[PDB]
Amino acid sequence: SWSWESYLEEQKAITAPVSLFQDSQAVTHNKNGFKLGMKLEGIDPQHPSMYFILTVAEVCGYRLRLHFDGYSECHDFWVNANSPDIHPAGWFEKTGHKLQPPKGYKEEEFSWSQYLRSTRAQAAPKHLFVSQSHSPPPLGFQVGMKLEAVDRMNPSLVCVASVTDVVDSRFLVHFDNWDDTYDYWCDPSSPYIHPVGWCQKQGKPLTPPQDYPDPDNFCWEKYLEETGASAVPTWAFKVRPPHSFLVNMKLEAVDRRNPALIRVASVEDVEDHRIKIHFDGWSHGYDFWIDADHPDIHPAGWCSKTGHPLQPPLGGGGSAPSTGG
């Protein structure tokens, strides 16, 4: 039997304190009421502005694997039961959002009552969730306002962006005149967003809207006038202090190569808002960077307290394939 207590003694190591994580990353006493076969609604992680019909394909501890109805299983993805990116059946119609129907359907063609009959299934109960859009909005951020944001797909770019939607306590960041595949959900403390004018005060180049006429001479004031849009007010931005994870601290993290697994991990390197994860016993070739507030990193003990299997360090110490670290 593997235990953190014994491992720390053996390695003469320390864990990353629970206080370093967000409450949502650390909470272990919540029940996961989702069951295999339950259907629901959710955003496509690779297309944050789109909503699809999803089915619980697997349950493990406080996590569940979701399947896009009608599409290939290669698109399946895992989330935690407290994910704010899934909603109960009927949410889209109740909140006025659009649905991308199951493969083989047209949008006019979808009705939850009929679909459940056709699939002889049941929708996940409303109480099973966390976001159904009854919550406090993000103060100061309204649809239509503009701001500057980092393109997470092209990290060196800070661009002209807009708030295109607000759901409970989060808002959707959209890159002006770029396709919505670049959109991503945020909250007021995100270190990836800044008020209009930030780049100029920092000396950083600002990426104007796609194909903006004479891009070199882009001027926020002129653009705000052309669009009649307001800039998100400066007071609304509540910058988050850099995290306090230190190199070598131990924790638990979802494996990026096989998301069904969670392994014993160590902080390999650090940035102001991200940490580099290294899986104990493994080579460093699989090490990866991840946001400090990412939903897939947790404090030691998360797995055992939630009922999820934890992969112990890989054995072999260099003599076995993929080891050395």
Ligand X SMILES: CN(C)CCCC[C@H](N)C(=O)O
- Cβ closer to ligand X: 18 or 157? 157
Q: Is 154 in the site for ligand X (CB under 6 A)?
A: yes
Contact stretch for ligand X (CB under 6 A) within 23-31, 129-137, 151-159, 271-279:
151-159
- Cβ closer to ligand X: 177 or 227? 177
- Cβ closer to ligand X: 150 or 270? 150
Q: Give strand ranges (E) for the chain.
A: 39-44, 47-60, 63-68, 77-80, 86-87, 146-151, 154-167, 170-175, 184-186, 193-194, 206-207, 250-254, 262-270, 274-279, 288-291, 297-298
Contact stretch for ligand X (CB under 6 A) within 62-70, 92-100, 152-160, 270-278:
152-160
Nearest residue to 302 (alpha-carbon basis) of 102, 49, 15: 15
Interface residue with ligand X, options 123, 159, 262, 267 (CB under 6 A): 159
Interface residue with ligand X, options 78, 141, 175, 279 (CB under 6 A): 175
Q: Is 184 in the site for ligand X (CB under 6 A)?
A: no
Q: Is 206 in the site for ligand X (CB under 6 A)?
A: no
Strands 206-207 and 154-167: parallel
Q: How many residues bind ligand X (CB under 6 A)?
A: 8
Interface residue with ligand X, options 69, 148, 151, 296 (CB under 6 A): 151
φ, ψ of residue 10 in degrees (nearest 5): -65, -45
Nearest residue to 61 (alpha-carbon basis) of 31, 17, 87: 31
- Cβ closer to ligand X: 51 or 178? 178
Rounded distance, CA 275 to CA 236, Å? 26
- Cβ closer to ligand X: 26 or 157? 157
- Cβ closer to ligand X: 174 or 274? 174
Q: Give strand ranges (E) for 128-287.
A: 146-151, 154-167, 170-175, 184-186, 193-194, 206-207, 250-254, 262-270, 274-279
Residues that bind ligand X (CB under 6 A): 151, 154, 157, 159, 175, 178, 182, 207
